[PDB]
Structure formats: C-alpha cells, structure tokens
Amino acid sequence: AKLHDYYKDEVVKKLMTEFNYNSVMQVPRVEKITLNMGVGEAIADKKLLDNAAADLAAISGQKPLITKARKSVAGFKIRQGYPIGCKVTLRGERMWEFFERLITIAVPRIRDFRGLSAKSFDGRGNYSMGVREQIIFPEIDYDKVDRVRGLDITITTTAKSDEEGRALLAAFDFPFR
Amino acid sequence: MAHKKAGGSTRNGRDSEAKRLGVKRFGGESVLAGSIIVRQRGTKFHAGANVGCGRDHTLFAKADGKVKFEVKGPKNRKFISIEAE
Amino acid sequence: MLQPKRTKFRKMHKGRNRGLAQGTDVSFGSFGLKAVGRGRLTARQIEAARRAMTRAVKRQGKIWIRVFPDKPITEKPLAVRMGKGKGNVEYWVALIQPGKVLYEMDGVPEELAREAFKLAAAKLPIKTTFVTKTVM
Amino acid sequence: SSLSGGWLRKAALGRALVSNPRVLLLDQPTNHLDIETIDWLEGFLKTFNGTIIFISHDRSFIRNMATRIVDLDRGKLVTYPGNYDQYLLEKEEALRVEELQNAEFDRKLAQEEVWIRQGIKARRTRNEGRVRALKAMRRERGERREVMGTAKMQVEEASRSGKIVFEMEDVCYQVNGKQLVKDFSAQVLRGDKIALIGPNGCGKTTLLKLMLGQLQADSGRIHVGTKLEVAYFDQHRAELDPDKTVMDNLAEGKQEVMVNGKPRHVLGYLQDFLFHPKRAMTPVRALSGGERNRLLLARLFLKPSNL
Amino acid sequence: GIREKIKLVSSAGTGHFYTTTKNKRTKPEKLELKKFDPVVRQHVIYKEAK
RNA sequence: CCGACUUACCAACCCGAUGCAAACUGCGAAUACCGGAGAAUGUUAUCACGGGAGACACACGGCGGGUGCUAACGUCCGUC
RNA sequence: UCCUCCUAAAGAGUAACGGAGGAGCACGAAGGUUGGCUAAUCCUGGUCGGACAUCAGGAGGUUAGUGCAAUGGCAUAAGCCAGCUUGACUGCGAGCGUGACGGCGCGAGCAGGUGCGAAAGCAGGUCAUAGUGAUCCGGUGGUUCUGAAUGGAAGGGCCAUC
RNA sequence: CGCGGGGUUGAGCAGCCUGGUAGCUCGUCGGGCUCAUAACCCGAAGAUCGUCGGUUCAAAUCCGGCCCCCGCAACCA
RNA sequence: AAAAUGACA
Numbered sequence A: 001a002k003l004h005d006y007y008k009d010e011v012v013k014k015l016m017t018e019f020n021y022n023s024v025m026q027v028p029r030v031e032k033i034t035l036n037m038g039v040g041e042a043i044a045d046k047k048l049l050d051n052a053a054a055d056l057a058a059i060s061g062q063k064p065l066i067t068k069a070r071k072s073v074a075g076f077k078i079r080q081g082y083p084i085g086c087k088v089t090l091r092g093e094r095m096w097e098f099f100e101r102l103i104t105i106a107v108p109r110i111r112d113f114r115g116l117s118a119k120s121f122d123g124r125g126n127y128s129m130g131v132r133e134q135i136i137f138p139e140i141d142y143d144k145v146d147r148v149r150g151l152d153i154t155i156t157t158t159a160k161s162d163e164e165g166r167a168l169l170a171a172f173d174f175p176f177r
Numbered sequence B: 001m002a003h004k005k006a007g008g009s010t011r012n013g014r015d016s017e018a019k020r021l022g023v024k025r026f027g028g029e030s031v032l033a034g035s036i037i038v039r040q041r042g043t044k045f046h047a048g049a050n051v052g053c054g055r056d057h058t059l060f061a062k063a064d065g066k067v068k069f070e071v072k073g074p075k076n077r078k079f080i081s082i083e084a085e
Numbered sequence C: 001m002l003q004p005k006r007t008k009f010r011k012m013h014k015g016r017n018r019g020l021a022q023g024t025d026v027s028f029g030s031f032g033l034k035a036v037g038r039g040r041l042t043a044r045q046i047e048a049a050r051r052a053m054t055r056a057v058k059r060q061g062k063i064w065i066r067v068f069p070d071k072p073i074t075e076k077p078l079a080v081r082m083g084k085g086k087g088n089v090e091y092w093v094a095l096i097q098p099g100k101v102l103y104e105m106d107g108v109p110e111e112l113a114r115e116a117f118k119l120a121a122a123k124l125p126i127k128t129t130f131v132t133k134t135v136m
Numbered sequence D: 001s002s003l004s005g006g007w008l009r010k011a012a013l014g015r016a017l018v019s020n021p022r023v024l025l026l027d028q029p030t031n032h033l034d035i036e037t038i039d040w041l042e043g044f045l046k047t048f049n050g051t052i053i054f055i056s057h058d059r060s061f062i063r064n065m066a067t068r069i070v071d072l073d074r075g076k077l078v079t080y081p082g083n084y085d086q087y088l089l090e091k092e093e094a095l096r097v098e099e100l101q102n103a104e105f106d107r108k109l110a111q112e113e114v115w116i117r118q119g120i121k122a123r124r125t126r127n128e129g130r131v132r133a134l135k136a137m138r139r140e141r142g143e144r145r146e147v148m149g150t151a152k153m154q155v156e157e158a159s160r161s162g163k164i165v166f167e168m169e170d171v172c173y174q175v176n177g178k179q180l181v182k183d184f185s186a187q188v189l190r191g192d193k194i195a196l197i198g199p200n201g202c203g204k205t206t207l208l209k210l211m212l213g214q215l216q217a218d219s220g221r222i223h224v225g226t227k228l229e230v231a232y233f234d235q236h237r238a239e240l241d242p243d244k245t246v247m248d249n250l251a252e253g254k255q256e257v258m259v260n261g262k263p264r265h266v267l268g269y270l271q272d273f274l275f276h277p278k279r280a281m282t283p284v285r286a287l288s289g290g291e292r293n294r295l296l297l298a299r300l301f302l303k304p305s306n307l
Numbered sequence E: 001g002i003r004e005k006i007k008l009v010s011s012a013g014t015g016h017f018y019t020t021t022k023n024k025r026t027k028p029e030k031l032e033l034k035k036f037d038p039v040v041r042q043h044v045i046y047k048e049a050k
Numbered sequence F: 001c002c003g004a005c006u007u008a009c010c011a012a013c014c015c016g017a018u019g020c021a022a023a024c025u026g027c028g029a030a031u032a033c034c035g036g037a038g039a040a041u042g043u044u045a046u047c048a049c050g051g052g053a054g055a056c057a058c059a060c061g062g063c064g065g066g067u068g069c070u071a072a073c074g075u076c077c078g079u080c
Numbered sequence G: 001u002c003c004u005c006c007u008a009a010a011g012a013g014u015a016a017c018g019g020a021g022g023a024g025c026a027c028g029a030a031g032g033u034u035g036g037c038u039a040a041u042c043c044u045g046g047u048c049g050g051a052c053a054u055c056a057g058g059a060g061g062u063u064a065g066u067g068c069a070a071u072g073g074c075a076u077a078a079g080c081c082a083g084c085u086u087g088a089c090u091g092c093g094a095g096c097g098u099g100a101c102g103g104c105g106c107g108a109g110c111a112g113g114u115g116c117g118a119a120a121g122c123a124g125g126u127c128a129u130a131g132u133g134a135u136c137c138g139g140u141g142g143u144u145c146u147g148a149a150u151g152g153a154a155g156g157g158c159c160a161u162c
Numbered sequence H: 001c002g003c004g005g006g007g008u009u010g011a012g013c014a015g016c017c018u019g020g021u022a023g024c025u026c027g028u029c030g031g032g033c034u035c036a037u038a039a040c041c042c043g044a045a046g047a048u049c050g051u052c053g054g055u056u057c058a059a060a061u062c063c064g065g066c067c068c069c070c071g072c073a074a075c076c077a
Numbered sequence I: 001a002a003a004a005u006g007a008c009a
C-alpha cells in the first residue's frame, strides 16, 4: 500500500542496524490485524448484531464473520451457537491499508488522548488495543448510530519477545506514552 | 407379642443377558472363509490382512488360511490377519 | 472421627484380609507404633488411641495417623429376617496387616515415647509394638 | 402483485368461482372487505344456486346467512337448530354440563388415590377389581382438556415517547391514476388512539408506510417522533418466514424473552398463549390462520414499545 | 410414540410401496424419494400416501 | 471504590514424601481354555442316527466368593 | 420384558428380596459419499465485560465430544462443517456365531438398477450394544394360483402391509 | 425400624403432575381519612423453596443420603 | 346505604 513500500527497506534498516541483525528476517514483521467486537447484549435484539456487523464492514471493507458461544455459561444466560459478536481478520494490502488510516486519521480522534499504553503486551510481542467508541472513524455518520459500540484490535506480530515488539511499532510512529 | 418385624425392599436387582463376546478362533487355527474370529464391542483388535469388520465390529475372515495375531502399528494396537493356505 | 468425605459408592463388599503390609517403615516422625497382628481397626479406636497420645506428652511434638478407615461396615438392625437388601452403613474401619505402622511421633524423648505408645496400644484390638526409625 | 388486501381477497373469491362450482367452500370470506363489499356479498351468496359451506368469525354475517350451524369442537362435530344466538346458548350448556361432569370424574379419582396408599390392616387383600379400575382411571386422564385455555397476554410498556409522534402537513401523495392522500395536515400526540377507516384500497396501508418512511411522500415532508419504539402488525403478516420454527420466529431466534419486569423468562411465553411446549419446532407454515395471527401478535407484545 | 407410520406408493402405476415413519407435527411436507420398483425394475419417484 | 493489612483458618492447582479401592490400571503371573504334531497306553473310551428310560427336593468336606456378625449342621454361586 | 457395569474365580457361561443406573425412543437428516478441520482446561493481553461471554498467543494433548445410561472404542477420527444426494435399494448368499427350540445375529461374493468420486473405491441405515409382542382372527393393495356340472363370481392361497 | 405425606418472604396455602413461570389472602412498614384508635382508601418492602450432593444448557419440581414433623400398619398362631 | 369505641383523678 502506502506504508508497505516504506517498511520493506526503511524499517528494516532502522532495526537491522539497531538490534544487530545479520538477516532481513531475524527482524520481526507484522503479519495480521485481527479485529472484533463482542456485542454481548444482542440477547434483546438481533438488530443489535445485524446493524453492528455493518460497523466493522464499514471500517474494514470485509464482511465480518459472526462468532458464536463456545461453551454455555449460566451467568451470562447464553448457550452454544448464539451469535454474540462479529470478527474480521485482515491480511496483506488491506492489512496495511487499514494500518495506515488507523495510526493517521483514526487515532488522533480519540477523546482524551494522552499517548498510547505500552504495557499491554502478551509476553511474545503482540499488541492489543481498545477504543471505547467507534465514532472515531471517518466511516461512521453519527446518524446511523444507536449505541456506543467499541472494538478490540489485536496487532499480531512475529516478534520473539515484547521488548522488540515496541521497536516494530515505534518505527511506524506509534504514539507510545 | 412382637414376633415378626417388617422388612424393607431393594431398589436394584435387575440385569441383562450375556452377549458371549470373545475370541472364537485362537491363533494357529486353520479357518475357512467368511467365518467369525473375534466378537468385539469396540475395536480392541483391528483388521489386518485378509480379514474384515462388521457393523458390530465383528472380525470375519475373507479367505481361507491360518489365524495370526500381531501388534504392528505406531500406537501398539493389536491386529488380526489371515495367511494364504 | 476420621470418616471419609464424598466416597464414590456407599456400600462395599466384605473382601478378605490376606498378605502383609506396605507402610512398613517410619518415614515422617522419629518413633512409630508397628502392628504385629491382623484385623480391622475402626474409627473410634483410632481416636481413643489419639487422645491417649496427645494427653500424655500434653503439648509437644507432632502425632501422625498413618491409616484412614475409608471402608464402610454395614449392620442389620435387631430382630430382622435375612435378605430384603443389605444392611445400612454403620461405621468405618481400616484393614490392618502385620508390619503396618499405625501412628508415629516426633520431638519427644524415647523413654517418654515408650510410655505414651504403651497407653495407646491398650485401646487397639491388635498386638502392636514400638519401632525406631533407622537410616535405611 | 399490486392490489390492496381487500382487492387481493376479492380475486381469490373469483378464482374459486370461475368454475361455477356446485359446492362453495368459503374459508374466511369476509376478512379485508369493507361494509359495502360485505353488504353486496350477502346478496351474491343468497342468490347463488349451489350449496355453500363457510367459516366466518363475523357474528353479524353469520346471522344473516346460516341455514344450519356446525361445531367441530374437539374432534367431534355436532349441529344445532335455530338462529345464531340459539347456538351460543346451547353450546354454553354443552360446556357447562361437560365442566360439571369433568369435575365429578376427578372427584372419584381423587378419593381413589387416598385409598391406594392407605394401610391394608390385618389380613386383607385390597381388591384388584378396584386397583385395575384406578389403573384405568389414571390411563383415561390422557384425554381432551375441555377449556382450550383463554390465552393470556400482556404488553411491554416502555419509556414515554416525545409529545409529538407524527407530524405531516402539506403532504400529498398520489398513485398514478387516483389520489390517495391530497394535501394532508394532521398531528398525532402522545397517548392518542387513532382508527383509520374507509373503503377498500383507499390508502390505509400505504398511509402507515409513509409514517414509517417505507415509501417517500411526493411532497410536504413528514417528521417522526423522537423516542419511538414501533411495534408493527402488517396486513399480510410478512414478518414470519413460514418455514422457520415456531420458537425461533417468536423472539427472533433467541431464548430469554422479557416479561413484565426483568428477563427471567424463556419459552414459557408460549404457555401464556396456549402453545404446547412439545410443538415448539413446528414450521410456521403448518400453523392455522388464527394461530399465526397470535404468534405475530405475541412477539410484538414481547418487546418494549411506545407505539 | 409421536412418529406415525406411512407408505410411499409408486408413481410408476405398478402397485408397490415402501413403508416408513414420519414426524408429522414437524414435517408438514410430503416425502418424494427415488427408489427401486421391482415390478418395473426401474428407479422411479415414490410419493407419500396412507 | 481501593483492601489500604494482620493471620488460631474453609482450601483449588503444583511440588516432595506416605497409604486405600468389586464397580480404578501407564504393569501382571500360576492354572485353566482353544488349535496343531509325536510316542506309549486304554476290551471305542469319540461322534451321528435309532428303541427305552429315569431325573429336574440334593447333603456335607477342601479351595475361590456374595449375604450374615469373616455367626449358624444358615443361605446363594464356581470347581473338585 | 429389554440394555450396561461389578459379583464372575485373566476363553464362554454362572445365583441371591446382592451393589449401581437406564429403555418402551429419536432422525428425510442426526443416513450415503467427496472434500476440509481438531478439543478440555489454565496463564498472559484487551471497551463496557465481570470468577465465568467474543478476541489474540502460549502451555497442555483428548482430562473435550458422541441425540439419550454404563462399558468397550474412536485422529485414517466413529467428533465439527460444507457440496451433491436417496444404498434407510430388489432377488440371493459360501461360511460362521449364539440358543433345548421358536428364534437372534455377522457376512465376503453373484445378478438387476442407482448415488457420490477424476479414479482406486465406498454405500443393503445411524461408533456398537435397549427403543419391544408368537399364533389365531380380521382389514387394505397386487397377482387368472384355485374356482365342488360348465363360463364367471364368492371364498381360499402366494407377495407387500395394518 | 416398615409405609405414605409434608418442610415454599411474619402466618396459612397454591405452584411439584412430567423442568424454565415463585404467586393469593392476612400480616409488617410508609402516607391518607378521624379529636384519637379501629375499620376503609392509596403505595412499598420482605423467601438461596429443611440441609448435602447428583443429572441436565436450565431444578421449588426429577433422583439419592441425612434432619424435623404428621398420619397409618404392626395380622395367623 | 355504611357510621364501632374512648381507664381512673
């Protein structure tokens, strides 16, 4: 896209010279951006997922895959097979194309922004993120909305540990605190 | 006088017929075709060379020969095979 | 009282009591009470032989109970004719073979141990003996 | 594919009469007709030369045209003489007496189960000519329940809507040929109950479509209320797929209905509507007309609504 | 014992039928299966009946 | 809200040590049973068909058990 | 009455008013094939959202699942999903197993047509074992087999079924 | 040492009848009427369904063990 | 139509 052409030669050399890498592959690469929201409260209405599914489809240009309840839980009053959330997994140009718009024209519209948390890592160099509101994207009209739907975005990387996971995102100007 | 005291019952005490499962032709027996070697309920013995498996998992011969018991396989699961006589 | 919590099946067959024991050697404490006879050792003889041990040294050391009943014993009521089921469960016993270390103690001097053990054995229906841990 | 509900019904009354049948079987003839059509049809059928069998829920259409009347209550059908109001009187006696004898049978079976578990005494036997009869009484209880059950219902009130529900002025929508609404100007306020009446095909169904924005007004603009929770009951039901199961169509393929206060109910919402819990996987197409009417009614009273 | 016995009378005219069961309160549709007709010795379409 | 904290405790899971099980098994005999070959021995002891039956209330003793109180010249099974 | 486990003594079988549970069904897909797939549980990170929902990667390796008990099995899956479908066929059947019998069962292969697959092939119901009732009598459909002087018919028989 | 039934906001009682629903009358509390109390009227709160498990996605309900209570039966010698 | 009662000093 308009970020991949940058990574293939620049971020490589910003890390090959940094982390003492003799190979263009010991450096990590970011391979997929999974993305999903768990609607959860769709027990009252199916329209709370019929219209919500069009929200990920309006952010990612991919029709979402509805997820389902893996195991019945009495407390949440669900059983196997409920559609309780939509999920999108992005790879390739659509991975990079969305990666471009999020860290450029979607992050700076977060209300009360004071940097990006850095301790949210899973010991293997993957990033997880929330937004708490979906109107921060330029694909939501404020008139098609009825709730405050949030998201969970989990950047999944091939880095072998967390401490270099920051470097992969930092070289893309990731607003770590 | 209080001679005979009342007695209770038993909630259980029912059972079913025996199905006579087992091995009908032990190893080294010359056996004909289509005859029954071992009766199963699962598959404790699998089907090797020249033998088959019924819907009951009954193992039957396919061609005449001798009965062979063997333990080939990565998971050490027992087979049955029939030679060529 | 040393009665099991949450067994799998309520009633159990009588069985037999043959062979020797397994816990033949002192392992936790420093002195132990070994059994020379065979028999079934109920849950109340275990307790009455544990009061007679605690109340002897009166505070000191630890007392280990190496055995646990986990074996129901059923008894028909008075004046019942035979059959019509199996007896309802009454109490729990542990089966004892020769050479099984029943109780064992630590932190008490040997001469105090001998008299303390000699007072518990009086409450058990089997001929016991006093044994001493060895390097092995 | 264009006519109204009243006209579509008229076509189905013609297609069943082109053949000039000697036997006319009219299942629910007067459903979407107006008073003029019903008034005219009451003379068409009276002059009709052959024989007519019809099922009508109109208590006024039946009186004008019913030579004989037939029950078909619970697997058995019985006839009745006299005018229509006679049947109501004679049927109520049939229901009262059958209610009277039904309780008496339970009375015997009630006191024949205190006796089965009574003590025997000294050396007596407990006659099996009475134990077997009680076995036949308990077996006979697999019988018809004489009262169908007066299906019970209740609505789900929600927060009050805005004081103005619909406002449309200067609105004038006209179909190609004739005008349906010409320069309307009206308001619908909170708690106002309005009845749309008129002739056939005069725009009642399309007027609601303008209100919900189904189809666009030619001019004049419509403004909708601000906290509305619409519950919609179409002329042709059209909101239940005839193949989907009864349980899934009711509450949109989900368990945990909300009843009264909090969502502490699931699938018991059928028992309030006299659905047997056994017949919960029946495809909707199998249900009768009235059963399908209530099922669509059931799931509208199933969700909060101000409208 | 909800299920009710039914038979599939052949459309090939030759009086022939297989019999089976069917849950009639959850299957309003009528079966139409292709099965052997030994009288005509061909595979024809069998439709439901009494 | 935070638990800001002491711990005579109700205790998951893991670790090292120690026991129990008819309805537990990552192990596992002795015997018995099925089939094949061999000599010796046994007035066919084997099998099929046919004529005639009786018997179908068992008892104790050893060994392996269920039940009973590891009671009974008790009771119910297997083998001799 | 029928099914599963122990008693039951390492082939089969084996009793008690011995110890524990289940069945009188369900399914035109939950059956046949051809493709593809692999759980429980815990840890870490993440909006509401939590002890337990969805998501990501780690350990673990079937402790999960099977339409319903228990046992035996199952990764080549017998579990999960999808396309096409009707072999949940007709006539037979070497050779066996189990019963005192009535019976009950497993079955390579042959012929006639059929489904899936590019084919090698697989398919005569469902991972297996419960989900059931003799005969007589009568009802429905088919078939010149018979038809009390002859030609019919009635009424019998054979096949399918209640 | 055998058989039936019961245990449900302070009281009484339905819901257990083939498993998803906890309700009715009196009482209690808070207002109102009256000089004041009754009565009357108008609103609220209050139950882990005796206890310990077991199936079930789901238990007041189905199964088992115990605790308390209440009826009934203990005959032929 | 309903309309009961109020320690002693």
Ligand SMILES: Nc1ncnc2c1ncn2[C@@H]1O[C@H](COP(=O)(O)OP(=O)(O)OP(=O)(O)O)[C@@H](O)[C@H]1O
Residues within 6 Å of the ligand: D001, D002, D003, D004, D005, D006, D007, D032, D175, D180, D199, D200, D201, D202, D203, D204, D205, D206, D207, D235
């Ligand atoms: N889809 C359509 N295409 C064309 N004309 C239509 C369509 N739907 C309705 N109409 C016409 O619009 C007019 C009003 O129809 P509508 O359905 O609103 O009737 P209605 O007033 O509700 O009457 P009724 O009580 O008979 O159902 C009629 O003339 C009808 O033929």
Ligand SMILES: [Mg+2]
Residues within 6 Å of the ligand: F056
């Ligand atoms: Mg006899």
Ligand SMILES: [Mg+2]
Residues within 6 Å of the ligand: none
């Ligand atoms: Mg006898």
Ligand SMILES: [Mg+2]
Residues within 6 Å of the ligand: none
């Ligand atoms: Mg005997």
Ligand SMILES: [Mg+2]
Residues within 6 Å of the ligand: none
């Ligand atoms: Mg004897």
Ligand SMILES: [Mg+2]
Residues within 6 Å of the ligand: none
């Ligand atoms: Mg055996």
Ligand SMILES: [Mg+2]
Residues within 6 Å of the ligand: G009
């Ligand atoms: Mg043996």
Ligand SMILES: [Mg+2]
Residues within 6 Å of the ligand: G030, G126
């Ligand atoms: Mg299946």
Ligand SMILES: [Mg+2]
Residues within 6 Å of the ligand: none
């Ligand atoms: Mg496959």
Ligand SMILES: [Mg+2]
Residues within 6 Å of the ligand: none
């Ligand atoms: Mg399958």
Ligand SMILES: [Mg+2]
Residues within 6 Å of the ligand: none
């Ligand atoms: Mg099965």
Ligand SMILES: [Mg+2]
Residues within 6 Å of the ligand: G147
């Ligand atoms: Mg003749």
Ligand SMILES: [Mg+2]
Residues within 6 Å of the ligand: none
């Ligand atoms: Mg005939």
Ligand SMILES: [Mg+2]
Residues within 6 Å of the ligand: none
């Ligand atoms: Mg008074």
Ligand code: NA
Residues within 6 Å of the ligand: D004, D005, D006, D204, D205, D206, D235
């Ligand atoms: Na209309």
Ligand code: NA
Residues within 6 Å of the ligand: D288, D289, D290
């Ligand atoms: Na109807």
